[PDB]
Design a binder for this molecule. Structure first.
Ligand SMILES: NC(=O)C1=CN([C@@H]2O[C@H](COP(=O)(O)OP(=O)(O)OC[C@H]3O[C@@H](n4cnc5c(N)ncnc54)[C@H](O)[C@@H]3O)[C@@H](O)[C@H]2O)C=CC1
Ligand SMILES: Cc1cc2nc3c(=O)[nH]c(=O)nc-3n(C[C@H](O)[C@H](O)[C@H](O)COP(=O)(O)O)c2cc1C
Ligand code: SF4
Ligand code: SF4
Ligand code: SF4
Ligand code: SF4
Ligand code: SF4
Ligand code: FES
Ligand code: FES
Ligand SMILES: [Mg+2]
Lengths: 217, 43, 433, 59, 230
């Protein structure tokens, strides 16, 4: 339905221009490496990665992080505010340690994505916008993740977990709670985008270097 | 020869800074960037 | 004998993406063994004109979804230098629902993409290649960076790139969750550190593109095949598919099929053969089929009456009033709510609009509200035609082609499943009065 | 539908209905209406002058 | 010389290379409806009100951004152009608030006038309307953001003419909003001009609020004495 998130900023004691934020020296080295890729005089092009880098160090993006990126790149702060509010991967509010994103678009929904969503909700006791009181998990729904063949699928902090049933997602949650990391990929003995049984093509050994090369080359 | 193994397990061991670490590593082989002649469009 | 008529049975000796499933090593050592980075120097030394000709002879059409002829499009940067650097941008956004081809190409055959970037940049006279990848594809981007690193170490890119004398760089820039950033101009804007809002054309990227410099935007699949076409020749690539529909194609078969997957197949394969051979058919049998979206959510859906005899190429599906799109087949059986699926697609488009232009920003949200009411049956029949006209107003009046992709599924649903809408309205009125 | 002496009405809360749009002043064929307006102390859009010259009015 | 010949409604005119369709139509004295184009700001092309039909072309072009091509025949009053204007007005008015009696823009509204001149006379919108919270950008420019049609004129003026980068758009799609994202006073010696260029009552004069309507005012053309620019 409606977004729910506000696109204005109101200062809070935990999120104000004086909230402490600064890059680590290693992050400054990474910022220099990011900046070098773009042509000189076009330094702003680094707003998208560097902002992400800030979120990768802090967890979310306080207004002070946006101000720091704007000052480092010498870009007006409103431009960084525009970038932060435009893209949905930027967290302008704190999230849990593990950000569960379940796809509910049509190809993913046709393979019973609602079963996964309800299983997650009954396993965690939270809704599709809330954060668990332990501050470990946050559940939201997202549009197509590009893993439609493997639907139903879930994305957690850069890991795809695909071909899910309620039991698989519940045990992934259990493994994530007990201090372990689960292996990404399909959860049905597939480990690819292959057909679920038979491997209809790509069975013969791949051709060698120069097999089909044309004459005169 | 074998086609029963999905070798692709490098990503399992990928951390939060792996992409940026690879970017820093690749910053060495890069050709010198061109220049428009300004420090910024507002210079 | 020429002019084949039954396309859709090609063996693995003619598949470009031999590591589509990732069984083989995705690293450079594996790529070279399969047939990658072979005679790159020879291809580079042949010159941009020769490279451009091979693309032209093949008849290669853009695999990103529009199907614009690749050779002509690439030839737009064959102008002499004007003092500005030239760039090639690879579109790896892959935001279309139902589409997962570029993800597999990136994660399992990255060196194909890197070599395609090199050869395409040589053809365009480009200076470096920027690969704009989806932000959610963190592991795919990391595999891509590993591949680029081992190509730099082996001297396959960078300074002189070969025993060639041509300097070329490959950069990977990650997006941050925006489907609109798949559009070429919106992608260019997002690379330059702005909101992903599309530009107006003209100018086209070949005149004013990224950083204001001449640019060419190409789909990942379109670029990857570029070196295989050069090595084997355009004539060979053409020898597949109907006229003006040459080559092979990656298809993502998902939805109500027994074995959803992705597969390389000849271009003009019939839809039924593709679904029943590779995907294992529709759950409940072929007679359980209700509708098929042949090219991702942006294309209108077709009913079982058309699906049994339509070919999977550009012109054939255009004649079926739908379009090939991204070759992302989504199957829905007689057990699904056909209005709910279209409503979910419209909700996706409402959540993905950038908001720049009036017809998209207002009318897609309007269509979302109307469609959500249609799902329940709240509406009246006189609104259905009304909804049709709303789509017509949106289509062709927006800066970007996201408005077209929002208006076409609604038109397809109304064109083929109007009686279901009317009976839903009648039922809601009956139990509500 | 009888047209007689003019009156200014209120909402049931006792707040005046008039918001000083001045459409009555623009439409009046006799120019019988005179309106002056300003923001009220609570920021409301209200009139400070609302006159009808009953010997100009054609009813 | 370098002039090229183009036709507006079948009538020949000579224009400089790179001239937009809107300027060519202006050469023969026809004004193309607009909301986002201002001849002193950079071209945006977002409103889509200026869409016109070129003869033997299936797609309407944006007249404010598209350069005329030699031999082109603009058609400013064809059925395609009229239906484009009607549809764009419909999308513009879908979420607009019923604020005319309380809006200071009332008799001076480009939206109102172009609705009367080029749009339809009816609504077929049966949903609820969007509403947005107000921004406070100082004591001079009153802000009623629900009225905003997202032209972006204020953003282009502030960035290019005034030299300030305080205004922008946050969010995307239907929820996209024009503002500062933080409590900031858009204070500058040229700030009040964003009231003039804003076509709707989203940006109004705070000192002038509610005092007068445009049809009752008498206009006296005069000179300023607040400085030596005259
Ligand atoms: N791969 C994915 O996930 C997605 C794919 N799509 C596909 O995108 C298609 C439509 O996208 P568009 O970019 O609007 O296609 P388009 O019709 O605008 O043209 C496609 C290509 O041809 C170029 N081109 C066209 N006319 C030209 C000219 N006169 N001069 C120079 N270059 C020209 C364009 O610059 C562009 O590169 C849709 O059919 C859709 O299937 C859409 C969303 C996502
Ligand atoms: C809303 C929208 C999203 C798009 N997303 C993608 C995408 O993710 N990947 C892609 O290759 N093309 C995408 N396209 C189409 C691009 O315009 C296309 O890639 C570009 O024209 C070059 O593609 P080509 O190599 O097939 O010619 C998108 C188009 C639109 C309108
Ligand atoms: S059609 Fe939609 S996505 Fe494309 S530019 Fe217009 S508002 Fe943005
Ligand atoms: S000014 Fe006249 S028309 Fe307007 S609200 Fe008051 S009484 Fe009614
Ligand atoms: S003449 Fe009297 S009744 Fe008629 S508009 Fe004026 S005030 Fe009203
Ligand atoms: S801006 Fe114009 S259309 Fe909108 S409420 Fe004010 S007068 Fe009416
Ligand atoms: S406030 Fe006025 S000028 Fe600014 S974007 Fe909205 S309508 Fe345009
Ligand atoms: S619809 Fe779920 S990943 Fe594409
Ligand atoms: S005036 Fe041309 S798009 Fe707004
Ligand atoms: Mg104004």
């Amino acid at each position: 339905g409606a977004g729910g998130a506000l696109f204005v900023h109101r200062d809070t004691p935990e999120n104000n221009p004086d909230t402490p934020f600064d890059f680590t020296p290693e992050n400054y080295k990474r910022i220099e490496a990011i900046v070098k890729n773009y042509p000189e005089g076009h330094k702003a092009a680094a707003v998208l990665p560097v902002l992400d880098l800030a979120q990768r160090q802090n967890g979310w993006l306080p207004i002070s992080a946006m101000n720091k990126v704007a000052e480092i790149l010498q870009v007006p702060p409103m431009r960084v505010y525009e970038v932060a509010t435009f893209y949905t991967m930027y967290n302008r509010k704190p999230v849990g340690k593990y950000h569960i994103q379940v796809c509910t678009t049509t190809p993913c929904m046709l393979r019973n994505s609602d079963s996964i969503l309800e299983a997650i909700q009954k396993k965690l006791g939270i809704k599709v916008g809330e954060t668990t009181p332990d501050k470990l998990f946050t559940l939201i729904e997202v549009e197509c993740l590009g893993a439609c063949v493997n639907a139903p699928m879930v994305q957690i902090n850069d890991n795809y977990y695909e071909d899910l049933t309620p039991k698989d997602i519940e045990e992934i949650i259990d493994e994530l709670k007990a201090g372990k990391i689960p292996k990404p990929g399909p959860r049905s003995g597939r480990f690819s985008c292959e057909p679920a049984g038979g491997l209809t093509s790509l069975t013969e050994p791949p051709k060698g270097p120069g097999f089909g090369v044309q004459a005169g080359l | 020869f074998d086609n029963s193994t999905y070798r692709n397990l490098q990503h399992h061991e990928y951390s939060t800074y792996t992409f940026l670490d690879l970017n820093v590593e690749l910053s060495k082989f890069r050709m010198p960037q061109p220049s428009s002649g300004r420090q910024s469009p507002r210079h | 004998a020429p002019k084949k008529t039954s396309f859709g049975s090609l063996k693995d000796e003619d598949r470009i993406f031999t590591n589509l499933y990732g069984r083989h090593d995705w690293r450079l050592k594996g790529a070279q063994s399969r047939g990658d980075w072979y005679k790159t120097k020879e291809i580079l030394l042949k010159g941009p004109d020769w490279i451009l000709g091979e693309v032209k002879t093949s008849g290669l059409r853009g695999r990103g979804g529009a199907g614009f002829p690749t050779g002509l499009k690439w030839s737009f940067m064959n102008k002499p230098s004007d003092g500005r650097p030239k760039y090639l941008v690879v579109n790896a956004d892959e935001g279309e629902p139902g589409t997962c081809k570029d993800r597999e190409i990136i994660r399992h055959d990255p060196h194909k993409l890197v070599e395609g970037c090199l050869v395409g940049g040589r053809a365009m006279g480009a200076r470096a290649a920027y690969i704009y990848i989806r932000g959610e594809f963190y592991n795919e981007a990391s595999n891509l960076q590993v591949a680029i690193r081992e190509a730099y170490e082996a001297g396959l890119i960078g300074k002189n790139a070969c025993g060639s004398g041509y300097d070329f760089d490959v950069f990977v820039v990650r997006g941050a969750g925006a489907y609109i950033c798949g559009e070429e101009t919106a992608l260019i804007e997002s690379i330059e550190g702005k909101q992903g809002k599309p530009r107006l054309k003209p100018p086209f990227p070949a005149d004013v593109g990224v950083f204001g410099c001449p640019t060419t935007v190409a789909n990942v699949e379109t670029v990857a095949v570029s070196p295989t076409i050069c090595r084997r020749g355009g004539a060979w690539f053409a020898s597949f598919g109907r006229e003006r529909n040459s080559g092979t194609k990656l298809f993502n078969i998902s939805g109500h099929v027994n074995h959803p997957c992705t597969v390389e197949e000849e271009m003009s394969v019939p839809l039924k053969e593709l679904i029943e051979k590779h995907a294992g058919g529709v759950i409940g049998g072929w007679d359980n089929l209700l509708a098929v979206i042949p090219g991702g959510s942006s294309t209108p859906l077709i009913p079982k009456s058309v699906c049994e005899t339509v070919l999977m190429d550009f012109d054939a599906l255009v004649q079926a009033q739908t379009g090939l799109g991204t070759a992302a087949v989504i199957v829905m059986d007689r057990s699904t709510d056909i209005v709910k699926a279209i409503a979910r697609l419209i909700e996706f488009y409402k959540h993905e609009s950038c908001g720049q232009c009036t017809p998209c920003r207002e009318g897609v949200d309007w269509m979302n509200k109307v469609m959500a009411r249609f799902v329940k049956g709240d509406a009246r029949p006189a609104e259905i035609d009304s909804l049709w006209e709303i789509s017509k107003q949106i289509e062709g009046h927006t800066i970007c082609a996201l408005g077209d992709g929002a208006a076409w599924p609604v038109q397809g649903l109304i064109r083929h499943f109007r009686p279901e809408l009317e009976e839903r309205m009648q039922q809601f009125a009956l139990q509500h009065q | 539908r009888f047209r007689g002496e003019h009156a200014l009405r209120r909402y049931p809360s006792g707040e005046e209905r008039c918001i000083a749009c001045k459409l009555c002043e623009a439409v009046c064929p006799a120019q019988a209406i005179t309106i002056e307006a300003e923001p009220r102390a609570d920021g409301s859009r209200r009139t400070t002058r609302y006159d009808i010259d009953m010997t100009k009015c054609i009813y | 010389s370098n002039l090229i010949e183009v036709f507006v409604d079948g009538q020949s005119v000579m224009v400089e290379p790179g001239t937009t369709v809107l300027q060519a139509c202006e050469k023969v004295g026809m004004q193309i409806p607009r909301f986002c184009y201002h001849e002193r700001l950079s071209v945006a092309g977002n409103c889509r009100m200026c869409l016109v039909e070129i003869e033997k072309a299936p797609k309407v072009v944006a007249a404010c951004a598209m350069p005329v091509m030699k031999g082109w025949n603009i058609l400013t009053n064809s059925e395609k152009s009229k239906k484009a204007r009607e549809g764009v007005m419909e999308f513009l008015l879908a979420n607009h608030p019923l604020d005319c009696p309380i809006c200071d823009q009332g008799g001076e509204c480009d939206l109102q006038d172009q609705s009367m001149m080029f749009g339809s006379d009816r609504s077929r919108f049966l949903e609820g309307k969007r509403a947005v919270e107000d921004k406070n950008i100082g004591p001079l420019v009153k802000t009623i953001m629900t009225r905003c049609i997202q032209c972006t004129r204020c953003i282009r003026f502030a960035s290019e003419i005034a030299g300030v980068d305080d205004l922008g758009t946050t969010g995307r799609g239907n929820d996209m909003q024009v503002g500062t994202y933080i409590e900031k006073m858009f204070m500058s010696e040229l700030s009040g001009n964003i009231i003039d260029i804003c076509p709707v009552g989203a940006l109004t004069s705070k000192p002038y609020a509610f005092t007068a309507r445009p049809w009752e005012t008498r206009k006296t053309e005069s000179i300023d004495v607040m400085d030596a620019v005259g």
